[PDB]
Amino acid sequence: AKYTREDIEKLVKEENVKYIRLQFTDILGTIKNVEIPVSQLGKALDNKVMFDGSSIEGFVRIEESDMYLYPDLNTFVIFPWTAEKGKVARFICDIYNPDGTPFEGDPRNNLKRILKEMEDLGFSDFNLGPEPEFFLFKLDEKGEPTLELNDKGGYFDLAPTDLGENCRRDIVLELEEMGFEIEASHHEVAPGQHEIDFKYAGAVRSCDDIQTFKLVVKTIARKHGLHATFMPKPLFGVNGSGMHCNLSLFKNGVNAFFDENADLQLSETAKHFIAGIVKHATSFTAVTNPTVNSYKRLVPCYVAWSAQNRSPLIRIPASRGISTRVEVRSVDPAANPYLALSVLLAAGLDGIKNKLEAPAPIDRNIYVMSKEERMENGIVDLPATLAEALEEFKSNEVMVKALGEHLFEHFIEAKEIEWDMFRTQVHPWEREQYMSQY
Amino acid sequence: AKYTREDIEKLVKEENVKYIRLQFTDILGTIKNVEIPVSQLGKALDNKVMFDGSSIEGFVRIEESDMYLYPDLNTFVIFPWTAEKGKVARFICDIYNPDGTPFEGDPRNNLKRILKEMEDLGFSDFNLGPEPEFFLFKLDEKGEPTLELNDKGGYFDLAPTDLGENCRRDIVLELEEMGFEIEASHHEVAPGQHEIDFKYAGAVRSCDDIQTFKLVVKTIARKHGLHATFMPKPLFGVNGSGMHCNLSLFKNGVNAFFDENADLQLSETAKHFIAGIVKHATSFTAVTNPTVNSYKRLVCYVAWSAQNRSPLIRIPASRGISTRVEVRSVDPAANPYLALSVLLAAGLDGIKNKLEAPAPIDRNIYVMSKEERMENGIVDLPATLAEALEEFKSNEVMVKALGEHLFEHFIEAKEIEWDMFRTQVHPWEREQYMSQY
Ligand SMILES: [Mg+2]
Ligand SMILES: [Mg+2]
Ligand SMILES: [Mg+2]
Ligand SMILES: [Mg+2]
């Protein structure tokens, strides 16, 4: 643990907190929340705050199911921005059924579940190193955003100098003084694009910071007449934002992917784990890349791995010893971190649990080699549409078992609508073409 | 030394630095960096910070070169302008490969290489006194540049009175506080143009202040609703910007160009030095004058002259420990380290081969015909980036001045830039052809 009951109450009073924000997360990953005045902290800490859990069921909730909010003291956070009447603090709560049992449809529980599934295989933890990127569009006079990029910067360039905007440099200062452990940050390839790399930590805790991040970001951004969007492909013909996930299995407190003797120094646990994802990649994409836009960014356009290449689905970074990780470059910021990891973790366990090996490391042939040329090898292609990604998700087995009932049932259903809406829609593009030629 | 690890650590605390900018420079000159919280100063100081090396190669990136960042303590600086939760610092670094070796495709490190050559020849230092001219423009409500000049002044005029703007003034008052050693400054021959000269400095130290300079200018300019633009030929009709460079080699501390008892007091090492720049000027212009726009400002004839209109090489009056060669063709758009590199090479290639410098320039060159350019030293510079690249490609020493790598990519990045401009259909074209033809 970290914080204690009394420790909190002491920190709330001594710091003047009058607005406790009990927050969670729904199937889509959007920051859900139920606010209660400081005077309710009591009822809350005892885990007696009831809310309509139907919420968590995306935009397809029928009845009004009741569930409890189990806050976790180790996540007690006090936001920098003050209110006029007092400070505001937060707690991340696991949803629970009226019978004191973890709601099987909760995205954060589903992870502590697979995480328990990890330990059964004799593993200490699962650390995540996320590399989330976003754009910053200017706000108009009214308040609505516009395709007005906040700067014309380029990859790794030195965006607006310290004397001015530089919303990046600020989100960081904040995230740091707030409690984050960021490695570094820089300007991304696309103008107005930025990346902020966090250190590592336990899966469930990383997914926790991904959420807090997206939240902190948007907040500060607003306070700069800007709009922050973790949307995969904002503008056509411009670089898309992604969110590489640095993975690493620890056992008995030591990296289970390292081998200071085996070639590439990759333990047998690594390769195995590696092959695992590959096997289920083309399938868990519908999770790691939810939205319709996601695939407009998949034009790792190829399913392959190696020490380094143009658009590889996977990639093992230089770093050795502890920092012996596996990068999954397909996931985007739109994905739900608690599902991105749930699905990702299993995809790697099923390889370890079933001992699997993948083809030799992709040399220097992926982009140039044609499709059927990549078909004559262990180089398949990720699905190109959310429609197609979902089909490969409903048929996969470990995936379905990775989200269980609720999550699967509702996700597939929801996401189906998303696609039906988008396909039964008549876009401007259509008219541009067919309206006259036909 | 100037800043022991311990010292910096003492500084960052006492001054309250909550943001370390680990900045460097790519092949295209663009100033870049990797920002880390002060909560990583150690991880960085230990040269353990990684970043996508390919950022150097530029817009022609393909893969990701997991390279490292090695900060030069002595380049420690604390930007006057403060964030909020604290101040912001920085370190100009050197790019290294996962195997502790200096990335060969990095400029800052390249200049250092060419410095070893200058040393494996007895020479101790190779100084530089840049004269970076620039233009200042207004911004619109949206906060976008425009062709409106902050002032309509002229040569050495008394630019914006001390009351109000005087963007140039503050620019310098800031650089002074920062640590620069400014000689002077005036107002160039064009409305909104300016020039700031720096006390000569070490090949590297100077190139570094040139970069730091463009930044401080660029910044404060915004801090004044203006827009700084080192673009060489902002617009047709008005004067163009340029970054003269006062080259001067030293041996055993003292100047190796001076010579009390001798013709003009310019030692053989100097005469030969001039010589090497004459036969290479046309072959390094593409580097010293990168942008396709550079040549729109070069409308010019290779030849040295103690005094004249716009000669490629010039020899300032002052001598003694100030004796020096000035290459007036270079402009602010040029990657400083490469400009020096290419020049030090063209220069050293004359010192180690003892070259005979052709007679200087006398009367005006504007009245020099083309057939006589074949006879007399009137070999004009390249007219377009295209012709300048071919030339660069030709000369061997110039290629050995950036190494396979830095050379391989420069040619590419620059060739595509050209083809882009070439395959383009400009307004001018339509204006003169759509009606006639
Ligand atoms: Mg990236
Ligand atoms: Mg990475
Ligand atoms: Mg001048
Ligand atoms: Mg001069």
Side-chain angles (χ1 to χ4, degrees), chain A residues 148 152 155-158 161-163 166 168-169 173-174 176-177 182-185 308 310 315 318 364, chain B residues 18-19 21 31-33 35 39-40 43 50 52 61-64 66 79 83 85 88 142 144 219 222:
Chain A
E148 259 256 33
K152 287 86 174 181
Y155 195 41
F156 269 87
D157 287 356
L158 174 35
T161 312
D162 301 294
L163 226 190
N166 213 308
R168 188 197 305 139
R169 165 179 68 58
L173 296 178
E174 278 281 274
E176 262 281 338
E177 161 174 344
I182 336 149
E183 283 306 271
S185 46
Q308 189 58 285
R310 175 60 198 175
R315 189 205 61 152
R364 214 57 262 303
Chain B
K18 312 283 279 299
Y19 214 77
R21 289 185 171 302
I31 162 170
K32 299 180 175 186
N33 80 176
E35 31 228 66
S39 339
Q40 307 254 168
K43 187 175 183 302
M50 289 217 277
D52 180 10
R61 286 184 57 268
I62 300 298
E63 289 173 290
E64 173 171 347
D66 265 357
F79 302 145
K85 292 297 183 295
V88 180
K142 199 81 55 66
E144 295 310 296
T219 300
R222 184 190 220 171

Short mmCIF file of all heavy atoms in Angstrom, two decimals, chain A residues 148 152 155-158 161-163 166 168-169 173-174 176-177 182-185 308 310 315 318 364, chain B residues 18-19 21 31-33 35 39-40 43 50 52 61-64 66 79 83 85 88 142 144 219 222:
data_model
loop_
_atom_site.label_atom_id
_atom_site.label_comp_id
_atom_site.label_asym_id
_atom_site.label_seq_id
_atom_site.Cartn_x
_atom_site.Cartn_y
_atom_site.Cartn_z
N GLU A 148 -6.84 24.56 -36.27
CA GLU A 148 -5.74 25.51 -36.14
C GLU A 148 -4.64 24.93 -35.23
O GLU A 148 -4.70 25.05 -34.01
CB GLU A 148 -6.24 26.83 -35.54
CG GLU A 148 -6.46 27.98 -36.52
CD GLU A 148 -5.36 29.05 -36.45
OE1 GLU A 148 -4.19 28.70 -36.19
OE2 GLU A 148 -5.68 30.25 -36.67
N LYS A 152 4.00 25.37 -35.75
CA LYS A 152 4.47 24.69 -36.96
C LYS A 152 5.71 23.82 -36.74
O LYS A 152 6.44 23.49 -37.68
CB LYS A 152 4.76 25.70 -38.07
CG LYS A 152 3.53 26.32 -38.71
CD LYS A 152 3.04 27.54 -37.94
CE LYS A 152 1.90 28.23 -38.67
NZ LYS A 152 1.44 29.45 -37.94
N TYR A 155 9.49 17.27 -35.88
CA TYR A 155 10.01 16.21 -35.02
C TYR A 155 11.18 16.65 -34.15
O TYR A 155 12.17 17.20 -34.65
CB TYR A 155 10.43 15.03 -35.88
CG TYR A 155 10.67 13.74 -35.14
CD1 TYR A 155 9.82 13.34 -34.11
CD2 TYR A 155 11.68 12.88 -35.54
CE1 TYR A 155 9.98 12.09 -33.51
CE2 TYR A 155 11.84 11.64 -34.95
CZ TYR A 155 10.99 11.25 -33.95
OH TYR A 155 11.15 9.98 -33.43
N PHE A 156 11.06 16.40 -32.86
CA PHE A 156 12.08 16.75 -31.88
C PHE A 156 12.53 18.21 -31.87
O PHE A 156 13.43 18.57 -31.10
CB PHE A 156 13.31 15.85 -32.03
CG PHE A 156 13.25 14.61 -31.18
CD1 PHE A 156 12.62 13.46 -31.66
CD2 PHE A 156 13.78 14.60 -29.89
CE1 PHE A 156 12.53 12.32 -30.86
CE2 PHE A 156 13.69 13.46 -29.09
CZ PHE A 156 13.07 12.32 -29.58
N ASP A 157 11.93 19.04 -32.70
CA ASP A 157 12.28 20.46 -32.74
C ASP A 157 12.09 21.10 -31.37
O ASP A 157 11.66 20.46 -30.42
CB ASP A 157 11.41 21.21 -33.77
CG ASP A 157 11.79 20.91 -35.22
OD1 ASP A 157 12.77 20.16 -35.46
OD2 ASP A 157 11.10 21.44 -36.13
N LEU A 158 12.41 22.39 -31.29
CA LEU A 158 12.25 23.13 -30.05
C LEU A 158 11.04 24.03 -30.22
O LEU A 158 11.16 25.19 -30.61
CB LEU A 158 13.52 23.94 -29.77
CG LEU A 158 13.55 24.92 -28.60
CD1 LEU A 158 12.74 24.41 -27.44
CD2 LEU A 158 14.99 25.13 -28.21
N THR A 161 9.52 28.80 -27.76
CA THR A 161 10.49 28.98 -26.69
C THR A 161 9.82 29.37 -25.39
O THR A 161 8.73 29.93 -25.37
CB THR A 161 11.53 30.06 -27.05
OG1 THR A 161 12.03 29.81 -28.37
CG2 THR A 161 12.71 30.02 -26.06
N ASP A 162 10.51 29.05 -24.30
CA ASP A 162 10.04 29.31 -22.95
C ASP A 162 9.21 30.58 -22.77
O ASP A 162 8.33 30.62 -21.92
CB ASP A 162 11.24 29.34 -22.00
CG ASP A 162 12.02 28.03 -22.01
OD1 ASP A 162 11.46 27.00 -21.57
OD2 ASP A 162 13.18 28.04 -22.46
N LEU A 163 9.49 31.61 -23.57
CA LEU A 163 8.75 32.88 -23.46
C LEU A 163 7.49 32.91 -24.34
O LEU A 163 7.49 33.51 -25.43
CB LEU A 163 9.65 34.06 -23.82
CG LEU A 163 9.62 35.28 -22.89
CD1 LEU A 163 10.39 36.42 -23.54
CD2 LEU A 163 8.18 35.70 -22.63
N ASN A 166 3.99 27.29 -25.03
CA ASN A 166 4.67 26.08 -24.59
C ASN A 166 3.82 25.39 -23.53
O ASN A 166 4.13 25.39 -22.34
CB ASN A 166 6.05 26.41 -24.04
CG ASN A 166 7.05 25.30 -24.32
OD1 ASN A 166 6.80 24.13 -24.02
ND2 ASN A 166 8.19 25.67 -24.90
N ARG A 168 3.29 22.27 -23.63
CA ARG A 168 3.97 21.02 -23.33
C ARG A 168 4.71 21.24 -22.03
O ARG A 168 4.28 20.76 -20.98
CB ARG A 168 4.99 20.66 -24.42
CG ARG A 168 5.59 19.26 -24.24
CD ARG A 168 6.87 19.07 -25.05
NE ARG A 168 6.66 19.38 -26.46
CZ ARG A 168 7.52 20.04 -27.21
NH1 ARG A 168 8.66 20.49 -26.70
NH2 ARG A 168 7.24 20.27 -28.49
N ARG A 169 5.82 21.98 -22.10
CA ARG A 169 6.64 22.28 -20.92
C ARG A 169 5.83 22.48 -19.64
O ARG A 169 6.33 22.21 -18.55
CB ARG A 169 7.48 23.54 -21.17
CG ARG A 169 8.10 24.15 -19.91
CD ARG A 169 8.95 25.38 -20.20
NE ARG A 169 8.14 26.51 -20.67
CZ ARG A 169 7.14 27.04 -19.97
NH1 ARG A 169 6.84 26.55 -18.78
NH2 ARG A 169 6.46 28.07 -20.46
N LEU A 173 5.69 20.23 -16.13
CA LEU A 173 5.93 20.84 -14.83
C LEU A 173 4.82 20.40 -13.87
O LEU A 173 5.09 19.96 -12.76
CB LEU A 173 5.93 22.37 -14.93
CG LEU A 173 7.00 23.10 -15.74
CD1 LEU A 173 6.70 24.59 -15.70
CD2 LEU A 173 8.39 22.80 -15.20
N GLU A 174 3.57 20.50 -14.33
CA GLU A 174 2.42 20.09 -13.52
C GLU A 174 2.45 18.60 -13.18
O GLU A 174 2.47 18.23 -12.01
CB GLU A 174 1.11 20.43 -14.25
CG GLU A 174 0.64 21.88 -14.11
CD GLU A 174 -0.06 22.15 -12.77
OE1 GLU A 174 -1.28 21.90 -12.71
OE2 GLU A 174 0.60 22.59 -11.80
N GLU A 176 4.67 16.63 -13.02
CA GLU A 176 5.78 16.36 -12.12
C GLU A 176 5.45 16.78 -10.69
O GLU A 176 5.44 15.95 -9.78
CB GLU A 176 7.04 17.10 -12.60
CG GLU A 176 8.01 16.23 -13.39
CD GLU A 176 8.86 15.35 -12.50
OE1 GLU A 176 9.00 15.69 -11.31
OE2 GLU A 176 9.39 14.33 -12.99
N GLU A 177 5.19 18.06 -10.49
CA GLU A 177 4.87 18.55 -9.16
C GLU A 177 3.62 17.86 -8.64
O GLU A 177 3.40 17.80 -7.43
CB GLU A 177 4.66 20.06 -9.19
CG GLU A 177 3.90 20.59 -8.00
CD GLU A 177 3.84 22.10 -7.99
OE1 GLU A 177 4.64 22.73 -8.73
OE2 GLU A 177 3.00 22.66 -7.24
N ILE A 182 7.97 11.38 -15.27
CA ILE A 182 8.12 11.43 -16.71
C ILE A 182 9.60 11.36 -17.10
O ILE A 182 10.44 12.01 -16.49
CB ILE A 182 7.56 12.74 -17.24
CG1 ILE A 182 6.52 13.26 -16.27
CG2 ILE A 182 6.91 12.52 -18.58
CD1 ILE A 182 6.46 14.72 -16.26
N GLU A 183 9.92 10.56 -18.10
CA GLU A 183 11.31 10.47 -18.50
C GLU A 183 11.72 11.71 -19.26
O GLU A 183 12.74 12.33 -18.94
CB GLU A 183 11.52 9.22 -19.36
CG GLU A 183 11.58 7.93 -18.54
CD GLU A 183 12.61 7.96 -17.41
OE1 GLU A 183 13.78 7.59 -17.65
OE2 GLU A 183 12.25 8.37 -16.27
N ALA A 184 10.92 12.08 -20.26
CA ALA A 184 11.21 13.26 -21.08
C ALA A 184 10.07 13.55 -22.04
O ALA A 184 9.06 12.85 -22.06
CB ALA A 184 12.49 13.04 -21.87
N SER A 185 10.24 14.60 -22.84
CA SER A 185 9.23 15.01 -23.81
C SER A 185 9.88 15.74 -24.99
O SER A 185 11.01 16.24 -24.87
CB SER A 185 8.19 15.90 -23.11
OG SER A 185 8.82 16.88 -22.30
N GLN A 308 14.91 -3.31 -34.96
CA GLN A 308 14.54 -1.99 -35.48
C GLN A 308 14.20 -2.06 -36.97
O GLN A 308 14.89 -2.72 -37.75
CB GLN A 308 15.67 -0.98 -35.25
CG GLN A 308 15.32 0.47 -35.56
CD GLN A 308 14.14 0.98 -34.74
OE1 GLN A 308 12.98 0.65 -35.01
NE2 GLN A 308 14.43 1.79 -33.73
N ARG A 310 11.33 0.03 -40.24
CA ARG A 310 10.44 1.14 -40.60
C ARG A 310 9.11 1.18 -39.83
O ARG A 310 8.92 2.04 -38.96
CB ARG A 310 10.17 1.12 -42.11
CG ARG A 310 9.16 2.14 -42.59
CD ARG A 310 9.58 3.57 -42.29
NE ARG A 310 8.45 4.49 -42.35
CZ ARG A 310 8.52 5.78 -42.02
NH1 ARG A 310 9.67 6.30 -41.61
NH2 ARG A 310 7.44 6.54 -42.10
N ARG A 315 9.02 -4.11 -31.32
CA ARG A 315 10.41 -3.71 -31.36
C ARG A 315 11.06 -3.67 -29.98
O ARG A 315 10.61 -2.96 -29.09
CB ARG A 315 10.56 -2.35 -32.01
CG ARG A 315 12.01 -2.02 -32.25
CD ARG A 315 12.25 -0.52 -32.33
NE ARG A 315 11.88 0.16 -31.08
CZ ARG A 315 12.45 1.28 -30.67
NH1 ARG A 315 13.43 1.83 -31.38
NH2 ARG A 315 12.06 1.84 -29.53
N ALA A 318 17.09 -0.85 -27.43
CA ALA A 318 18.48 -1.10 -27.06
C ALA A 318 18.61 -1.60 -25.62
O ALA A 318 18.99 -2.75 -25.38
CB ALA A 318 19.30 0.19 -27.24
N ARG A 364 15.63 -6.55 -42.89
CA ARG A 364 15.51 -5.19 -43.39
C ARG A 364 14.61 -5.27 -44.62
O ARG A 364 14.96 -4.78 -45.71
CB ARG A 364 16.89 -4.65 -43.76
CG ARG A 364 17.08 -3.16 -43.50
CD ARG A 364 16.82 -2.81 -42.04
NE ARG A 364 15.47 -2.29 -41.83
CZ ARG A 364 14.96 -1.23 -42.46
NH1 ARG A 364 15.70 -0.59 -43.36
NH2 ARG A 364 13.74 -0.80 -42.20
N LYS B 18 13.46 23.99 -13.05
CA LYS B 18 12.52 22.87 -13.06
C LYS B 18 12.33 22.31 -14.46
O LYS B 18 11.34 21.62 -14.72
CB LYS B 18 11.17 23.32 -12.52
CG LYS B 18 11.28 24.09 -11.21
CD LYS B 18 11.53 23.18 -10.02
CE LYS B 18 10.25 22.53 -9.54
NZ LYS B 18 9.25 23.55 -9.10
N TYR B 19 13.27 22.59 -15.36
CA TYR B 19 13.17 22.14 -16.74
C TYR B 19 14.50 22.23 -17.51
O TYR B 19 14.95 23.33 -17.85
CB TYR B 19 12.13 22.98 -17.47
CG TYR B 19 11.35 22.23 -18.51
CD1 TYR B 19 10.34 21.36 -18.14
CD2 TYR B 19 11.64 22.38 -19.86
CE1 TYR B 19 9.62 20.65 -19.10
CE2 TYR B 19 10.93 21.68 -20.83
CZ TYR B 19 9.92 20.81 -20.44
OH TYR B 19 9.20 20.11 -21.39
N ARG B 21 16.59 21.73 -20.84
CA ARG B 21 16.48 21.55 -22.29
C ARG B 21 17.80 20.97 -22.81
O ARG B 21 18.82 21.66 -22.87
CB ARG B 21 16.19 22.88 -23.00
CG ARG B 21 14.79 23.46 -22.79
CD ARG B 21 14.58 24.70 -23.64
NE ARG B 21 13.21 25.19 -23.67
CZ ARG B 21 12.15 24.48 -24.06
NH1 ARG B 21 12.31 23.22 -24.44
NH2 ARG B 21 10.95 25.03 -24.10
N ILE B 31 17.13 24.03 -34.97
CA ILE B 31 17.52 23.85 -33.58
C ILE B 31 16.51 22.91 -32.92
O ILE B 31 15.32 23.17 -32.97
CB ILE B 31 17.63 25.23 -32.87
CG1 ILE B 31 17.60 25.07 -31.35
CG2 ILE B 31 16.56 26.18 -33.39
CD1 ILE B 31 17.93 26.34 -30.60
N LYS B 32 17.00 21.82 -32.33
CA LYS B 32 16.15 20.81 -31.69
C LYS B 32 16.55 20.44 -30.26
O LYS B 32 17.63 20.83 -29.78
CB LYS B 32 16.14 19.54 -32.54
CG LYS B 32 15.59 19.72 -33.94
CD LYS B 32 15.62 18.40 -34.71
CE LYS B 32 14.97 18.52 -36.08
NZ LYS B 32 14.88 17.20 -36.75
N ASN B 33 15.70 19.67 -29.58
CA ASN B 33 15.98 19.26 -28.21
C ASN B 33 15.05 18.19 -27.62
O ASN B 33 14.04 17.81 -28.21
CB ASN B 33 15.96 20.49 -27.29
CG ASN B 33 14.55 20.93 -26.89
OD1 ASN B 33 14.38 21.86 -26.09
ND2 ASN B 33 13.54 20.26 -27.44
N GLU B 35 13.26 17.66 -23.92
CA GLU B 35 13.02 18.24 -22.61
C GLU B 35 12.72 17.27 -21.50
O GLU B 35 11.82 16.43 -21.61
CB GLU B 35 11.94 19.32 -22.68
CG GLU B 35 10.84 19.12 -23.74
CD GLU B 35 10.60 20.38 -24.56
OE1 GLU B 35 11.53 20.77 -25.31
OE2 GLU B 35 9.51 21.00 -24.46
N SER B 39 14.14 16.66 -12.52
CA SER B 39 14.07 15.38 -11.85
C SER B 39 14.69 14.28 -12.72
O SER B 39 14.29 13.12 -12.65
CB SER B 39 12.59 15.08 -11.59
OG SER B 39 11.84 16.29 -11.60
N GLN B 40 15.67 14.66 -13.55
CA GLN B 40 16.36 13.70 -14.43
C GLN B 40 17.71 14.28 -14.83
O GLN B 40 18.40 13.74 -15.69
CB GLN B 40 15.53 13.42 -15.69
CG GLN B 40 14.09 12.98 -15.44
CD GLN B 40 13.85 11.51 -15.69
OE1 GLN B 40 12.80 10.97 -15.32
NE2 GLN B 40 14.80 10.85 -16.33
N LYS B 43 20.29 11.48 -14.57
CA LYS B 43 20.18 10.50 -15.65
C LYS B 43 20.75 11.05 -16.95
O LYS B 43 21.29 10.29 -17.77
CB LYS B 43 18.71 10.10 -15.85
CG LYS B 43 18.50 8.96 -16.83
CD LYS B 43 17.03 8.53 -16.89
CE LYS B 43 16.83 7.32 -17.82
NZ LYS B 43 17.32 7.58 -19.21
N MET B 50 18.31 8.80 -23.80
CA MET B 50 18.13 8.34 -25.17
C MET B 50 17.04 9.13 -25.88
O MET B 50 16.09 9.60 -25.24
CB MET B 50 17.73 6.88 -25.21
CG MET B 50 18.81 5.92 -24.84
SD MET B 50 18.60 4.49 -25.91
CE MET B 50 17.31 3.57 -25.02
N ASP B 52 15.31 9.52 -30.24
CA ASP B 52 15.38 8.99 -31.60
C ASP B 52 16.43 9.76 -32.42
O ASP B 52 16.19 10.86 -32.92
CB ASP B 52 14.02 9.07 -32.28
CG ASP B 52 14.06 8.53 -33.70
OD1 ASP B 52 15.08 7.93 -34.07
OD2 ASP B 52 13.06 8.71 -34.44
N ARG B 61 13.85 11.13 -42.46
CA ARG B 61 13.94 10.01 -41.51
C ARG B 61 13.27 8.76 -42.06
O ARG B 61 12.31 8.84 -42.81
CB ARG B 61 13.26 10.37 -40.19
CG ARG B 61 14.03 11.34 -39.32
CD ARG B 61 13.32 11.56 -37.99
NE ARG B 61 13.10 10.32 -37.23
CZ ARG B 61 12.00 9.57 -37.29
NH1 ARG B 61 11.00 9.91 -38.09
NH2 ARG B 61 11.90 8.48 -36.55
N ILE B 62 13.79 7.60 -41.66
CA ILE B 62 13.24 6.31 -42.08
C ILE B 62 13.04 5.44 -40.85
O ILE B 62 11.91 5.13 -40.45
CB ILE B 62 14.18 5.58 -43.07
CG1 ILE B 62 14.41 6.44 -44.32
CG2 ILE B 62 13.58 4.25 -43.49
CD1 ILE B 62 13.15 6.71 -45.11
N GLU B 63 14.16 5.04 -40.25
CA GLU B 63 14.14 4.21 -39.06
C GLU B 63 14.47 5.05 -37.84
O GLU B 63 14.60 6.27 -37.92
CB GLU B 63 15.17 3.07 -39.16
CG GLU B 63 14.83 1.97 -40.15
CD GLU B 63 15.98 0.98 -40.31
OE1 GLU B 63 17.02 1.37 -40.89
OE2 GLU B 63 15.86 -0.17 -39.84
N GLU B 64 14.63 4.36 -36.71
CA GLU B 64 14.92 5.00 -35.44
C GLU B 64 16.28 4.57 -34.91
O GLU B 64 16.49 3.41 -34.57
CB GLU B 64 13.80 4.63 -34.47
CG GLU B 64 14.01 5.05 -33.05
CD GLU B 64 12.76 4.83 -32.23
OE1 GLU B 64 11.70 4.59 -32.85
OE2 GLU B 64 12.83 4.90 -30.98
N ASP B 66 18.47 4.56 -32.02
CA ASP B 66 18.53 4.73 -30.57
C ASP B 66 19.86 5.33 -30.10
O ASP B 66 20.68 4.64 -29.50
CB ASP B 66 18.34 3.38 -29.88
CG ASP B 66 16.90 3.13 -29.48
OD1 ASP B 66 16.07 4.04 -29.68
OD2 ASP B 66 16.63 2.02 -28.95
N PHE B 79 18.22 30.22 -19.30
CA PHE B 79 17.38 31.18 -20.03
C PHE B 79 16.73 32.20 -19.12
O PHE B 79 15.97 31.84 -18.23
CB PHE B 79 16.30 30.43 -20.79
CG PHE B 79 16.83 29.43 -21.77
CD1 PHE B 79 16.15 28.25 -21.99
CD2 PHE B 79 18.00 29.68 -22.47
CE1 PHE B 79 16.63 27.32 -22.90
CE2 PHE B 79 18.48 28.77 -23.37
CZ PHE B 79 17.79 27.58 -23.59
N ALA B 83 9.64 29.93 -16.70
CA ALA B 83 8.40 29.18 -16.85
C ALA B 83 7.54 29.70 -15.70
O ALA B 83 7.43 30.91 -15.52
CB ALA B 83 8.66 27.70 -16.69
N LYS B 85 6.42 27.19 -12.61
CA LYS B 85 6.81 26.32 -11.51
C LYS B 85 8.33 26.40 -11.34
O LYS B 85 8.91 25.68 -10.53
CB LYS B 85 6.38 24.87 -11.79
CG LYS B 85 4.86 24.64 -11.77
CD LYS B 85 4.29 24.92 -10.40
CE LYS B 85 2.80 24.64 -10.31
NZ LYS B 85 2.01 25.54 -11.17
N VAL B 88 14.06 27.62 -16.62
CA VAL B 88 14.40 26.60 -17.61
C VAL B 88 15.87 26.72 -17.96
O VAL B 88 16.37 27.82 -18.20
CB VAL B 88 13.58 26.74 -18.90
CG1 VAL B 88 13.99 25.66 -19.89
CG2 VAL B 88 12.10 26.64 -18.58
N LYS B 142 -4.21 37.19 -35.50
CA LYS B 142 -4.17 35.72 -35.42
C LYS B 142 -2.79 35.32 -34.88
O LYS B 142 -2.59 34.18 -34.44
CB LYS B 142 -4.36 35.13 -36.83
CG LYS B 142 -4.79 33.66 -36.91
CD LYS B 142 -6.30 33.51 -36.70
CE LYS B 142 -7.12 34.37 -37.68
NZ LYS B 142 -6.99 33.97 -39.12
N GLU B 144 0.09 35.81 -36.79
CA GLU B 144 0.84 35.31 -37.93
C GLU B 144 1.70 36.36 -38.62
O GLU B 144 1.32 37.53 -38.72
CB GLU B 144 -0.12 34.70 -38.95
CG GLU B 144 -0.83 33.49 -38.42
CD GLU B 144 0.15 32.50 -37.81
OE1 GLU B 144 1.00 31.98 -38.56
OE2 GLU B 144 0.06 32.27 -36.59
N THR B 219 12.78 34.52 -30.03
CA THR B 219 11.93 34.64 -28.84
C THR B 219 11.46 36.06 -28.59
O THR B 219 10.31 36.41 -28.84
CB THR B 219 12.65 34.15 -27.57
OG1 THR B 219 13.01 32.77 -27.70
CG2 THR B 219 11.74 34.30 -26.36
N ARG B 222 8.96 37.79 -30.67
CA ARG B 222 7.56 37.43 -30.47
C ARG B 222 7.09 38.23 -29.26
O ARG B 222 5.99 38.80 -29.25
CB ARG B 222 7.45 35.92 -30.19
CG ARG B 222 6.02 35.37 -30.06
CD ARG B 222 6.01 33.93 -29.53
NE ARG B 222 5.00 33.09 -30.20
CZ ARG B 222 4.89 31.77 -30.05
NH1 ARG B 222 5.72 31.11 -29.24
NH2 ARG B 222 3.95 31.10 -30.72
#
